[PDB]
Write an enzyme that holds these catalytic residues in place. Structure first.
Site, PDB file in Angstrom:
ATOM      1  N   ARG A  65     -39.774 -21.755  15.861  1.00  0.00           N
ATOM      2  CA  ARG A  65     -40.244 -20.471  16.339  1.00  0.00           C
ATOM      3  C   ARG A  65     -39.682 -20.132  17.712  1.00  0.00           C
ATOM      4  O   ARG A  65     -39.238 -21.014  18.469  1.00  0.00           O
ATOM      5  CB  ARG A  65     -41.766 -20.466  16.412  1.00  0.00           C
ATOM      6  N   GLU A 120     -52.398 -25.209  18.059  1.00  0.00           N
ATOM      7  CA  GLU A 120     -51.170 -24.461  17.835  1.00  0.00           C
ATOM      8  C   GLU A 120     -51.115 -23.368  18.899  1.00  0.00           C
ATOM      9  O   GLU A 120     -50.057 -22.794  19.180  1.00  0.00           O
ATOM     10  CB  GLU A 120     -51.204 -23.833  16.433  1.00  0.00           C
ATOM     11  N   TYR A 146     -51.041 -23.888   7.095  1.00  0.00           N
ATOM     12  CA  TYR A 146     -49.741 -23.282   7.367  1.00  0.00           C
ATOM     13  C   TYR A 146     -48.790 -23.476   6.196  1.00  0.00           C
ATOM     14  O   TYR A 146     -49.010 -24.327   5.338  1.00  0.00           O
ATOM     15  CB  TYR A 146     -49.093 -23.914   8.627  1.00  0.00           C
ATOM     16  N   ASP A 186     -53.754 -28.078   9.063  1.00  0.00           N
ATOM     17  CA  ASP A 186     -53.580 -28.517  10.457  1.00  0.00           C
ATOM     18  C   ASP A 186     -54.987 -28.941  10.858  1.00  0.00           C
ATOM     19  O   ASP A 186     -55.630 -28.292  11.674  1.00  0.00           O
ATOM     20  CB  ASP A 186     -53.098 -27.375  11.362  1.00  0.00           C
ATOM     21  N   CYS A 224     -46.369 -37.411   6.405  1.00  0.00           N
ATOM     22  CA  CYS A 224     -45.293 -37.431   7.380  1.00  0.00           C
ATOM     23  C   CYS A 224     -45.953 -37.845   8.698  1.00  0.00           C
ATOM     24  O   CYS A 224     -47.102 -37.477   8.968  1.00  0.00           O
ATOM     25  CB  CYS A 224     -44.688 -36.026   7.489  1.00  0.00           C
ATOM     26  N   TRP A 268     -42.403 -32.910  19.027  1.00  0.00           N
ATOM     27  CA  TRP A 268     -42.411 -32.126  17.777  1.00  0.00           C
ATOM     28  C   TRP A 268     -41.002 -31.573  17.981  1.00  0.00           C
ATOM     29  O   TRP A 268     -40.818 -30.526  18.598  1.00  0.00           O
ATOM     30  CB  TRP A 268     -43.471 -31.032  17.908  1.00  0.00           C
ATOM     31  N   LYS A 328     -36.311 -29.257  15.699  1.00  0.00           N
ATOM     32  CA  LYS A 328     -35.599 -28.104  16.227  1.00  0.00           C
ATOM     33  C   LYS A 328     -34.695 -28.415  17.408  1.00  0.00           C
ATOM     34  O   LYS A 328     -33.797 -27.635  17.712  1.00  0.00           O
ATOM     35  CB  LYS A 328     -36.584 -27.019  16.657  1.00  0.00           C
TER      36      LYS A 328
HETATM   37  C1  LIG Z   1     -44.493 -35.208  10.231  1.00  0.00           C
HETATM   38  C2  LIG Z   1     -44.136 -33.752  10.588  1.00  0.00           C
HETATM   39  C3  LIG Z   1     -43.229 -33.499  11.666  1.00  0.00           C
HETATM   40  C4  LIG Z   1     -42.800 -32.199  12.043  1.00  0.00           C
HETATM   41  C5  LIG Z   1     -43.301 -31.069  11.277  1.00  0.00           C
HETATM   42  C6  LIG Z   1     -44.230 -31.315  10.223  1.00  0.00           C
HETATM   43  C7  LIG Z   1     -44.652 -32.615   9.877  1.00  0.00           C
HETATM   44  C8  LIG Z   1     -45.647 -32.768   8.707  1.00  0.00           C
HETATM   45  N1  LIG Z   1     -42.870 -29.751  11.523  1.00  0.00           N
HETATM   46  C9  LIG Z   1     -41.911 -29.541  12.530  1.00  0.00           C
HETATM   47  C10 LIG Z   1     -41.367 -28.242  12.691  1.00  0.00           C
HETATM   48  O1  LIG Z   1     -41.692 -27.237  11.987  1.00  0.00           O
HETATM   49  N2  LIG Z   1     -40.394 -28.105  13.684  1.00  0.00           N
HETATM   50  C11 LIG Z   1     -39.968 -29.179  14.494  1.00  0.00           C
HETATM   51  O2  LIG Z   1     -39.083 -28.923  15.368  1.00  0.00           O
HETATM   52  N3  LIG Z   1     -40.461 -30.446  14.304  1.00  0.00           N
HETATM   53  C12 LIG Z   1     -41.387 -30.600  13.343  1.00  0.00           C
HETATM   54  N4  LIG Z   1     -41.880 -31.940  13.089  1.00  0.00           N
HETATM   55  C13 LIG Z   1     -41.333 -33.026  13.954  1.00  0.00           C
HETATM   56  C14 LIG Z   1     -40.022 -33.590  13.519  1.00  0.00           C
HETATM   57  O3  LIG Z   1     -40.073 -33.784  12.099  1.00  0.00           O
HETATM   58  C15 LIG Z   1     -39.817 -34.908  14.274  1.00  0.00           C
HETATM   59  O4  LIG Z   1     -39.815 -34.587  15.666  1.00  0.00           O
HETATM   60  C16 LIG Z   1     -38.493 -35.538  13.904  1.00  0.00           C
HETATM   61  O5  LIG Z   1     -38.500 -35.848  12.493  1.00  0.00           O
HETATM   62  C17 LIG Z   1     -38.302 -36.811  14.650  1.00  0.00           C
HETATM   63  O6  LIG Z   1     -37.013 -37.340  14.308  1.00  0.00           O
HETATM   64  P1  LIG Z   1     -36.639 -38.809  14.786  1.00  0.00           P
HETATM   65  O7  LIG Z   1     -35.248 -39.078  14.394  1.00  0.00           O
HETATM   66  O8  LIG Z   1     -36.990 -38.942  16.241  1.00  0.00           O
HETATM   67  O9  LIG Z   1     -37.507 -39.903  14.013  1.00  0.00           O
HETATM   68  P2  LIG Z   1     -37.719 -40.363  12.484  1.00  0.00           P
HETATM   69  O10 LIG Z   1     -37.049 -39.434  11.511  1.00  0.00           O
HETATM   70  O11 LIG Z   1     -39.127 -40.874  12.316  1.00  0.00           O
HETATM   71  O12 LIG Z   1     -36.693 -41.572  12.495  1.00  0.00           O
HETATM   72  C18 LIG Z   1     -36.835 -42.795  13.231  1.00  0.00           C
HETATM   73  C19 LIG Z   1     -36.097 -43.858  12.372  1.00  0.00           C
HETATM   74  O13 LIG Z   1     -36.225 -45.145  12.989  1.00  0.00           O
HETATM   75  C20 LIG Z   1     -36.325 -46.109  11.951  1.00  0.00           C
HETATM   76  N5  LIG Z   1     -36.883 -47.297  12.571  1.00  0.00           N
HETATM   77  C21 LIG Z   1     -38.189 -47.476  13.038  1.00  0.00           C
HETATM   78  N6  LIG Z   1     -38.389 -48.678  13.567  1.00  0.00           N
HETATM   79  C22 LIG Z   1     -37.164 -49.327  13.452  1.00  0.00           C
HETATM   80  C23 LIG Z   1     -36.703 -50.635  13.829  1.00  0.00           C
HETATM   81  N7  LIG Z   1     -37.508 -51.531  14.442  1.00  0.00           N
HETATM   82  N8  LIG Z   1     -35.414 -50.965  13.565  1.00  0.00           N
HETATM   83  C24 LIG Z   1     -34.592 -50.049  12.946  1.00  0.00           C
HETATM   84  N9  LIG Z   1     -34.922 -48.810  12.560  1.00  0.00           N
HETATM   85  C25 LIG Z   1     -36.242 -48.483  12.833  1.00  0.00           C
HETATM   86  C26 LIG Z   1     -37.173 -45.422  10.899  1.00  0.00           C
HETATM   87  O14 LIG Z   1     -37.108 -46.076   9.624  1.00  0.00           O
HETATM   88  C27 LIG Z   1     -36.677 -44.002  10.933  1.00  0.00           C
HETATM   89  O15 LIG Z   1     -35.735 -43.731   9.912  1.00  0.00           O
HETATM   90  O1  LIG Z   2     -45.397 -24.094  15.152  1.00  0.00           O
HETATM   91  C1  LIG Z   2     -44.838 -25.058  14.572  1.00  0.00           C
HETATM   92  O2  LIG Z   2     -43.753 -25.442  14.999  1.00  0.00           O
HETATM   93  C2  LIG Z   2     -45.512 -25.706  13.358  1.00  0.00           C
HETATM   94  C3  LIG Z   2     -46.936 -25.772  13.219  1.00  0.00           C
HETATM   95  C4  LIG Z   2     -47.524 -26.378  12.066  1.00  0.00           C
HETATM   96  C5  LIG Z   2     -46.667 -26.923  11.050  1.00  0.00           C
HETATM   97  C6  LIG Z   2     -45.241 -26.831  11.230  1.00  0.00           C
HETATM   98  N1  LIG Z   2     -44.628 -26.226  12.374  1.00  0.00           N
END
Ligand SMILES: *Cc1cc2c(cc1C)nc1c(=O)[nH]c(=O)nc-1n2C[C@H](O)[C@H](O)[C@H](O)COP(=O)(O)OP(=O)(O)OC[C@H]1O[C@@H](n2cnc3c(N)ncnc32)[C@H](O)[C@@H]1O
Ligand SMILES: O=C(O)c1ccccn1
Length: 393
Positions: free
Chosen positions: A52, A100, A257, A275, A320, A354, A357
């Site tokens: 957003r 939010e 949402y 939420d 998630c 979060w 984006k």
């Molecule tokens: C859960 C969620 C998040 C979310 C969202 C809605 C939900 C239900 N809506 C969002 C939105 O509309 N806009 C936005 O900008 N963000 C939104 N989010 C957040 C976003 O999904 C997260 O900020 C993002 O996914 C984070 O990405 P990141 O790369 O930081 O992390 P991850 O995908 O969890 O990956 C971490 C990886 O690390 C591996 N891992 C963990 N521990 C280890 C160890 N010890 N060794 C090796 N690898 C490891 C994990 O397996 C993972 O793949």
């Molecule tokens: O405003 C946001 O970024 C939002 C809020 C709730 C679920 C996913 N995204």
């Protein structure tokens, strides 16, 4: 023991964007991912994420403006549009305050910043988007520049670019220990050991597991959130991301949402979620991967009653993980561990936010910190916050 300039712990979007940036600059980088690349067991799942334009935080507005050109550069490099303007719709009780935010107050911020938006009445919302049975006093706004992000296209893009740039990508390998010293960092995994000039922690909610033995702990909380996919039942003209602000009930927040339609897809499914108030996990291993039954019944029941454009019987429900600063006045943890431990500058940390984006920007920043100890971007407000009392020199 293999040597690399940078070892990235975690192969999600942030880890991959970081690896790509480091490798394209000509450095030796290794990415260690405990599960598989493209897995959906962390914070990255489903097909979409929302971006957003409306915020009451000056920080987020600035991060948004600085990240846009980086997304454009990525889209150009992978030959795929990843951001699609589908709109961001906020409606319901315009004064209720939620995690939010609040509609009226955000609308005032937009007025101040000249951010365009359309104000809509309950009748307009039902006519244009297909909602039904809304209380006649519900109102809201549609910010037309709101976007939805192609998650899988983004991951494919980052993975392929990092790989083409020379990054070594390894899956099914868990980092179990990090020990920084004056000359680099020793990295231990369940398969071997490595030496790194610097390590980037982009491991989702697992950051504290690797910092604990080093006497550090960040003040972030982990929440397992429920998400459901539904079949689109009726073709529609407009299908923006939407968030329904409502007065709470004695049992829950009564907030729901929907991510909106996915332009790159056949348009068969959309995802929605509650939420609701959820207690933080004690450790990510406490996550169950099973969406909370009551929350799913509440969400589906609300869609059944208010958005008949979708079949309210979910085709799939899942969870998630969200990782966010425990203190609500902080939104992201991105910096080095310099102020948290000896030789902490050798650990670049992306610990909470979060942030899908901002993936291109955070990757660039982590790369900057890993390869130069400094970034041109101001990250003073993103300082990783300690959960412990400050007693160090
Ligand atoms: C859960 C969620 C998040 C979310 C969202 C809605 C939900 C239900 N809506 C969002 C939105 O509309 N806009 C936005 O900008 N963000 C939104 N989010 C957040 C976003 O999904 C997260 O900020 C993002 O996914 C984070 O990405 P990141 O790369 O930081 O992390 P991850 O995908 O969890 O990956 C971490 C990886 O690390 C591996 N891992 C963990 N521990 C280890 C160890 N010890 N060794 C090796 N690898 C490891 C994990 O397996 C993972 O793949
Ligand atoms: O405003 C946001 O970024 C939002 C809020 C709730 C679920 C996913 N995204």
């Amino acid at each position: 023991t293999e040597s690399y300039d940078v070892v990235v712990v975690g192969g999600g979007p942030v880890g991959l964007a970081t690896a790509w940036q480091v490798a394209e600059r000509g450095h030796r980088v290794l990415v260690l991912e405990r599960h598989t690349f493209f897995n959906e067991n962390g914070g990255t799942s489903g097909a979409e994420r929302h971006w957003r334009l409306q915020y009451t935080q000056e920080d987020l507005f600035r991060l948004t403006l600085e990240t846009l050109p980086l997304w454009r550069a990525l889209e150009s490099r992978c030959e795929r549009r990843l951001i699609h303007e589908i709109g961001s719709l906020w409606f319901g009780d315009t004064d209720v305050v939620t995690n939010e935010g609040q509609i009226s107050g955000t609308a005032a911020m937009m007025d101040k910043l000249s951010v365009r938006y359309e104000w809509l009445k309950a009748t307009d919302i039902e006519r244009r988007f297909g909602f039904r049975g809304l209380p006649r006093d519900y109102e809201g706004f549609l910010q037309p520049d709101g976007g939805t992000i192609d998650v899988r296209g983004t991951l494919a893009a980052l993975f392929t670019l990092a790989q083409a740039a020379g990054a070594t990508l390894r899956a099914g390998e868990t980092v179990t220990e990090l020990v920084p010293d004056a000359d680099g960092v020793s990295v231990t995994t369940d398969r071997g050991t490595y030496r790194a000039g610097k390590v980037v922690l982009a491991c989702g909610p697992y950051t504290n597991d690797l910092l604990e033995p080093l006497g550090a702990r960040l003040a972030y909380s982990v929440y397992e959130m429920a998400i459901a996919a539904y079949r689109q039942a009726t073709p529609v003209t407009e299908a923006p991301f939407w968030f329904a602000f409502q007065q709470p009930t004695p049992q829950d927040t009564n907030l729901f949402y929907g991510f909106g339609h996915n332009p790159w897809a056949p348009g068969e499914f959309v995802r929605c979620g509650p939420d609701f108030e959820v207690d933080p996990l004690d450790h990510p291993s406490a996550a169950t991967g099973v969406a909370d039954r009551r929350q799913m019944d509440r969400l589906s029941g609300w869609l059944r009653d208010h958005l008949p454009t979708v079949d309210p019987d979910p085709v799939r429900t899942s969870t998630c993980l969200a990782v966010l600063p425990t203190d609500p006045e902080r939104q992201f943890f991105l910096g080095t561990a310099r102020d948290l431990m000896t030789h902490g500058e050798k650990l670049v940390v992306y610990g909470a936010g979060w942030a899908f984006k901002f993936v291109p920007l955070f990757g660039r920043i982590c790369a900057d910190l890993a390869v130069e100890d400094s970034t041109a971007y101001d990250i003073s407000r993103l300082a990783p916050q300690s959960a412990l009392l400050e007693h160090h020199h």
